[PDB]
Amino acid sequence: NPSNSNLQALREELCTPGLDQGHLFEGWPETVDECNERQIALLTDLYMFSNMYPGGVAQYIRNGHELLARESEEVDFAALEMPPLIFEAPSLHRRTAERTALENAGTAMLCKTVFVLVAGGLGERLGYSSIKVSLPVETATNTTYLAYYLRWAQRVGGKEVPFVIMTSDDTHDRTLQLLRELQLEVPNLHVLKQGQVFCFADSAAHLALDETGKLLRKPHGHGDVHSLIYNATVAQPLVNDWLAAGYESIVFIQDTNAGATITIPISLALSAEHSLDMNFTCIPRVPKEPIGLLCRTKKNSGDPWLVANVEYNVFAEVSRALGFSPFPGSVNTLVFKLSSYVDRLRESHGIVPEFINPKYSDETRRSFKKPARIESLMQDIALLFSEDDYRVGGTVFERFSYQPVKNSLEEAAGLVAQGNGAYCAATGEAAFYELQRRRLKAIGLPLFYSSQPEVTVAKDAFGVRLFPIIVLDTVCASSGSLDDLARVFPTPEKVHIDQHSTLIVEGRVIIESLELYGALTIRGPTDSMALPHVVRNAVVRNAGWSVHAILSLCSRLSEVDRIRGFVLKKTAMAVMDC
């Protein structure tokens, strides 16, 4: 594609003072024509970078110099305080007039929402070698995070719901594989793959090479989501299509937090009630947490206020220089008014402020432990919304609604020892089952069960309980609002599920009355508009399921089993079909 003179022009450019990439052509022939295949490929690699990064590799080097200098300084703001626009969401487990009104309004708003899933990571840190969205939300049904989000989105937004998945080189192919394998059919899905950026070997921004003599590449961060979206097309920009179809909101969700399907409707309702252009999903945080604070900030004494996410370390350091915190913690579920989001997008080309964070060998010598690269964060899009022209706020939810799976069993053990949340696969799964129970109790289902743990994991570090397990699919439970749950159980007081039981429900099912001592699956029509399978005067008793810890001695044991430390034994199961 690029001409020889172009590659030659770039090569000479990269050798000029201030760019100084001479080390890349050490021992090369004078002109392009004389260069071999490998050399021609390297120059083309450098040249093509321009279709990926504004200003190409030359501008990438300059930004590197600017950021490397910037990060050598102390981050500090002239002012830091509470965001003016913070709103408390009502509890997810109390069916109040307010909660009903917000779920109602929010659910209707879901019909005009674009959904964006950030999924560029493998689960290696967790102990899982595949893509994080292929993790099961729970092992009773083994429904993947990917299917869980997509089926919910198609339920609340219809089959044609606009959906974006951001992938990376690590996850892209495997994601397309999973979509096909799960037979997910999502007409308006767009899978956008982030491009990796070049790396700096040193503090002077000399470009790094890999083990094979090729330019090294690393992730540019999830800030890429915005530029991927801005550049996406259907000759029409993707966003133009959304706007023209009457879409009014856009929401960004993380890969392994099932809680989002509960918080999102509330956030939408509150964004409308309080006219918020950007709405951070928050939880109350204790001063000892690896989540950022939502702060009102002012970089320099003259600057206007900006409402953005600020990391703990930074926050503490800025305080001095100038039982939860007064400041909420951001879970990175971001809710936008679409028109505002698009306006900011168009003005910036989806470019959010960047930074660099090199890992050094020592505390002085300033040598890189590994090559560094420029990064950006998806939440930093907030910096593009001035207080003068936009309203940016936070909605504070119960900490229980935040259920990420992000730590390994070993890490969780250490964290718990320090009084911090485990946020591992064991607690993610247990929290999902408990979430279903709290929601069902809110509509009057009489669930009585022990709060004691049923299995202990991580070398007897902590315990979780699982039962009773109750999992309703999207055809059965629809959006999962309390009203939708009440449709499944019209006379809740007649449904008696023993604490050791398992109830799995798929399809258009209505349960009027049931006595369950064991495991039961009820299946109804897969078509939400078909006549429901109604269950009345059912009495089911069997051996049911059980759960036990994986012994240290340890086989059909997979990574999925080992990362949670226990296994369900699915010994017996009754089935009620047509």
Q: Compute CA distances 60 → 18, 68, 377, whole Å.
A: 12, 12, 17
**Euclidean distance between CA atoms 499 and 421, whole angstroms:** 25
SS3 state at 207: strand
Topology classification of domain 1-444:
Spore Coat Polysaccharide Biosynthesis Protein SpsA; Chain A (3.90.550)
Single-letter amino acid code for the residue at 60: Y
**136 pairs with which residues across the strands?**
144
**566 pairs with which residues across the strands?**
549
Q: Please name the helix (run of DSSP H) or strand (run of DSSP E) that holds residue 574, with its range, or none.
A: strand 574-576
How many CB atoms lie under 10 A from the CB of residue 173? Answer: 12
Q: Which residues are annotated as a binding site for UDP-alpha-D-galactose?
A: 118, 120-121, 194, 221-222, 254-255, 292, 311, 330, 379, 406
Q: Compute CA distances 482 → 93, 279, 396, 429, 472, whole Å.
A: 9, 23, 20, 21, 13
Instruction: Check if the beta carbon of residue 517 is closer than 8 Å to that of residue 501.
Output: yes
Q: Which residues are annotated as a binding site?
A: 118, 120-121, 132, 194, 221-222, 254-255, 292, 311-312, 330, 379, 402, 406
Backbone angles phi and psi of 342, in degrees to 5: -65, -40
Q: Kindly provide the resolution of this structure in angstroms, with one decimal.
A: 2.0
How many CB atoms lie under 10 A from the CB of residue 472? Answer: 25
Q: Compute CA distances 564 → 109, 138, 255, 300, 432, whole Å.
A: 36, 10, 17, 47, 14
- DSSP codes, 77-97: -SEEE--S-EEEPPPTT---H
The token pair at 246 is 């009457």
**Euclidean distance between CA atoms 140 and 125, whole angstroms:** 24
**Number of helices followed by number of strands (H, E) in the chain:** 16, 30
Contacts of 508 (CB under 8 A, 6+ apart): 475, 476, 524, 525, 526, 527, 528, 530, 531, 532, 533
Contacts of 66 (CB under 8 A, 6+ apart): none
**Euclidean distance between CA atoms 3 and 481, whole angstroms:** 59
Instruction: Check if the beta carbon of residue 254 is closer than 8 Å to that of residue 369.
Output: no
Q: Compute CA distances 270 → 113, 200, 445, whole Å.
A: 14, 44, 28
Q: Which residues are annotated as a binding site for UDP-alpha-D-glucose?
A: 118, 120-121, 194, 221-222, 254-255, 292, 311-312, 330, 379, 402, 406
HEC readout, 437-465: HHHHHHCCCCCCCCCCCCEEECCCCEEEC
Catalogue the E-assigned strands of 437-501: 455-457, 462-464, 469-472, 495-497
Backbone angles phi and psi of 157, in degrees to 5: -120, 0
**Euclidean distance between CA atoms 576 and 476, whole angstroms:** 14
- What is the CATH number assigned to the segment(s) 445-578? 2.160.10.30
The token pair at 142 is 């083994």
Q: Closest Cα to residue 154, out of 127, 132, 108, 187?
A: 187
Instruction: Check if the beta carbon of residue 364 is closer than 8 Å to that of residue 56.
Output: no
In the chain, residues under CATH classification 3.90.550.10 are 1-444
The experimental method behind these coordinates is X-ray
**Euclidean distance between CA atoms 241 and 309, whole angstroms:** 30
Length of the chain, in residues? 578
DSSP letter, residue 345:
H
In the chain, residues under CATH classification 2.160.10.30 are 445-578
Q: Please name the helix (run of DSSP H) or strand (run of DSSP E) that holds residue 68, with its range, or none.
A: helix 56-71
Q: Which residues are annotated as a binding site for UTP?
A: 118, 120, 132, 194, 255
**Euclidean distance between CA atoms 434 and 437, whole angstroms:** 5
SS3 state at 11: helix
**Euclidean distance between CA atoms 191 and 163, whole angstroms:** 9
Instruction: Check if the beta carbon of residue 88 is closer than 8 Å to that of residue 396.
Output: yes
